[PDB]
Symmetry: C2
Subunit: 108 residues, 2 copies
């Protein structure tokens, strides 16, 4: 490519979560993304636990937008986010092997 380019995902994000697996409920949390070029670290804080990402990848899809894929360790799951074009929000889901659910994040 002519330019080496990554979306700027750094900062704090509010999390609206919904556990979709049985007995699951709505929840809230706060995401902290720390980024050095294409290397991203994701910390999620809820009332009930913390998690930090283990490995994360930023990917691009034409017509869809940028996506962040990562595994994480709860106090080992998988999560992914698809960012809107303005990088101010994202919709995502997670799977912890069995719990799974969705998340909406809004940049703070």
């Amino acid at each position: 490519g002519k330019f080496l380019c990554v979306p700027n995902l750094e900062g704090r994000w509010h999390v609206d979560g919904h556990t979709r697996s049985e007995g699951g409920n709505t929840w809230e949390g706060e995401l902290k993304i720390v980024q050095t070029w294409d290397k991203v670290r994701i910390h999620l804080k809820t009332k009930a636990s913390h998690s930090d990402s283990v490995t994360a990848s930023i990917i691009y899809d034409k017509g869809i937008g940028y996506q962040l894929l990562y595994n994480y360790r709860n106090q080992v799951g998988f999560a992914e986010f698809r960012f809107d074009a303005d990088l101010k929000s994202a919709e995502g889901h997670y799977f912890n092997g069995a719990t799974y659910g969705t998340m909406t994040i809004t940049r703070i």
Copy 2:
């Protein structure tokens, strides 16, 4: 910024050089730029010497284009390049403290 972006300067470049200090002459060489995001290493090979960069910085100026500034050690000088918009060539100069001159590079 919304995007973390650096010009892709990686590859081999042909060097047309001109020493402008007294008794200076035309010369030729080959440049190798190795790049990890905004960290750049520049190796110049001529018939008479090698040099490797010590510290290098990519900078952007609106209306001028991207520039590469670095110091280097000959077998300690300063050099800078202003790339054309398509990143296929650049014009530059160097100062070794006293020799100084110009360089044109074309991407291979």
